[PDB]
Amino acid sequence: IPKIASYPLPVSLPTNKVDWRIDASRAVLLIHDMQEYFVHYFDSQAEPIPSLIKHIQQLKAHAKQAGIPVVYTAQPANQDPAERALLSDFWGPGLSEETAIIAPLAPESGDVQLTKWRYSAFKKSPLLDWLRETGRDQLIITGVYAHIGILSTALDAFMFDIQPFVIGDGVADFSLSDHEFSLRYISGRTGAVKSTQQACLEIAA
Amino acid sequence: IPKIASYPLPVSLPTNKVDWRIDASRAVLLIHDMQEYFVHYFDSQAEPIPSLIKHIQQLKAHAKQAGIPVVYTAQPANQDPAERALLSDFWGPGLSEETAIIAPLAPESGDVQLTKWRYSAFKKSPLLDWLRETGRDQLIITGVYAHIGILSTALDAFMFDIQPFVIGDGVADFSLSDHEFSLRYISGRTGAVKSTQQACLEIAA
Numbered sequence: 551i552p553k554i555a556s557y558p559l560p561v562s563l564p565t566n567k568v569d570w571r572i573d574a575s576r577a578v579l580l581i582h583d584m585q586e587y588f589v590h591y592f593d594s595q596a597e598p599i600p601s602l603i604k605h606i607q608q609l610k611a612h613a614k615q616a617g618i619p620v621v622y623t624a625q626p627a628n629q630d631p632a633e634r635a636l637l638s639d640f641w642g643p644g645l646s647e648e649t650a651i652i653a654p655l656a657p658e659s660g661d662v663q664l665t666k667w668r669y670s671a672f673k674k675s676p677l678l679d680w681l682r683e684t685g686r687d688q689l690i691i692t693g694v695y696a697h698i699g700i701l702s703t704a705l706d707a708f709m710f711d712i713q714p715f716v717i718g719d720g721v722a723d724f725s726l727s728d729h730e731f732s733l734r735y736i737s738g739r740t741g742a743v744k745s746t747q748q749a750c751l752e753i754a755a
Numbered sequence: 756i757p758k759i760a761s762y763p764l765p766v767s768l769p770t771n772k773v774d775w776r777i778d779a780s781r782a783v784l785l786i787h788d789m790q791e792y793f794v795h796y797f798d799s800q801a802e803p804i805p806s807l808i809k810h811i812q813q814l815k816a817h818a819k820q821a822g823i824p825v826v827y828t829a830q831p832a833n834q835d836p837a838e839r840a841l842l843s844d845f846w847g848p849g850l851s852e853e854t855a856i857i858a859p860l861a862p863e864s865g866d867v868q869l870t871k872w873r874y875s876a877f878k879k880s881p882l883l884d885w886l887r888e889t890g891r892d893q894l895i896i897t898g899v900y901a902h903i904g905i906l907s908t909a910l911d912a913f914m915f916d917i918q919p920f921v922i923g924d925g926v927a928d929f930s931l932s933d934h935e936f937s938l939r940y941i942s943g944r945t946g947a948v949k950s951t952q953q954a955c956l957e958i959a960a
C-alpha cells in the first residue's frame with residue numbers, strides 16, 4: 551500500500567492575479583526533488599505519477615529546445631544531524647538511499663544539480679547568486695511536494711524578485727487536496743500557476 | 756462594511772509534532788505588522804480584534820517581565836516601486852499612510868522596530884544577524900496576517916534553525932478559514948502553535 555493514495559492530476563487550475571508569461575531569455579526550469587526516495591511514497595504506476603513524469607519530460611524537452619537552463623535539486627543521503635537541525639524534529643533523520651533522480655528525468659551533462667538542504671531550494675545554495683549572475687529572473691517550478699518544498703521555493707523566489715511559475719500538472723503532493731490548496735495559495739499570493747500545455751506554448755513563442 | 760468580516764479567534768488549536776517549549780533565555784517576541792493600516796481592514800471593535808490585542812498585550816507584558824526582547828515589524832509608506840518589485844503585481848502600490856503601530860501595542864523605548872520589505876520579516880532586514888549575534892534561537896510570532904507574512908516569517912525562521920512559536924490566538928487573518936489553515940500548516944510543517952495562555956506559562960517558567 552503506497553503512503554500516498556492515487557489521485558488524478560488537476561486539469562482545472564486556479565486563475566492568476568498576474569499576467570506574467572514565460573520568456574525563454576529570462577527563465578530557468580527547476581525540477582525539484584524528483585528523487586527515487588520521494589517518488590516511492592506513491593505507486594509510480596498509478597495517477598498522478600505517469601502523467602507527472604510525462605509533463606516534466608515535455609517541459610524539459612521544450613526548455614532544452616528554447617535554450618532554457620534546467621536545474622535539479624536533490625536532498626543528500628545521511629544529512630549530518632547538526633546541519634539538518636530542526637528538520638529532524640518534523641521528519642526524522644532523512645534519506646539514507648534512493649537519492650538518485652528518477653531515470654525517466656535523468657539529468658543531462660549541462661543540467662545543474664543543486665544539493666537541497668531545506669524546504670526552499672534557495673537556502674544554503676548558490677541558486678540566487680546564479681540567477682542574478684546570469685540575469686535570469688523567472689523560475690519555472692516542477693516536482694514534489696507541492697505544499698512543502700515547491701511552495702517554499704516559490705515564496706523565496708518571489709521575495710527575491712524572481713517570478714515563480716508553478717506548473718499545476720507538473721507537480722504532485724501528499725493528496726489532491728494538498729495539491730489544489732498549494733496552487734490556490736500560489737496563484738493568490740506568490741506566483742503564477744500554468745498548465746504544462748500553456749507553459750510549453752509560452753516557452754516556444 | 757469592513758473588508759474582513761468579524762470572526763471569533765480560535766480557541767482550539769492544532770496539535771504539534773514537536774515538543775518545543777518557549778525558554779525566556781532563548782526567545783524573542785515578534786509583533787508582526789500590527790499597523791493601523793492592516794488593522795483597519797477589520798472592524799477593530801469586533802472579534803477577533805479586541806481579543807487579539809489583549810493577547811498580544813499580555814504576551815508583551817510577560818515577555819518584558821521575563822527578559823524576552825520584543826521586536827516589531829512595519830511596512831514603510833510609499834515603498835519605492837523598483838524596490839517593492841513583484842509585490843505590486845499582487846497588491847498594488849502599498850500603503851501611503853496609517854503606518855503607525857496601533858496605540859494599544861505602542862513600542863517602548865527598548866523595543867526594536869524593523870522595516871518590513873517582503874512577506875518574511877527576515878528578507879532585506881537585520882533580523883537573522885541580530886538573532887545569531889545574540890544567540891537567540893526561538894521566535895514567538897504574533898500579528899497579522901496569519902497565512903501571508905506570519906507563515907512566510909515562520910518558514911524562513913525554521914529554515915534558518917530558529918524555532919518558530921506561532922501564537923494561535925495571537926494572530927488574525929482574512930478569515931477564520933485562512934487563520935485555521937495557517938495554524939494547521941505551521942504545526943504540521945514549520946513550527947509550534949501555542950495558545951497565549953500556554954506561551955505565558957512557558958515564558959514565566
Ligand SMILES: CCCCCCCCO[C@@H]1O[C@H](CO)[C@@H](O)[C@H](O)[C@H]1O
Pocket residue numbers: 553554591625637641642643644645668669695698699724
Ligand atoms: C503522506 C505520506 C507522505 C510522506 C512523505 C515523507 C517524506 C519524508 O522526507 C522528508 O521530506 C521533507 C519534506 O520535503 C524534507 O524536508 C526532508 O528532508 C525529508 O526527510
Ligand SMILES: CCCCCCCCO[C@@H]1O[C@H](CO)[C@@H](O)[C@H](O)[C@H]1O
Pocket residue numbers: 758759796830842846847848849850873874900903904929
Ligand atoms: C480580504 C481583504 C483583506 C485585504 C488586506 C490587504 C492588505 C494590503 O496590503 C498589502 O499586504 C501585503 C500582504 O501582507 C503586503 O505584502 C503588501 O506590502 C501590502 O501592500
Ligand SMILES: [Ca+2]
Pocket residue numbers: 583669694695696698699700
Ligand atoms: Ca518537498
Ligand SMILES: [Ca+2]
Pocket residue numbers: 788874899900901903904905
Ligand atoms: Ca502579512
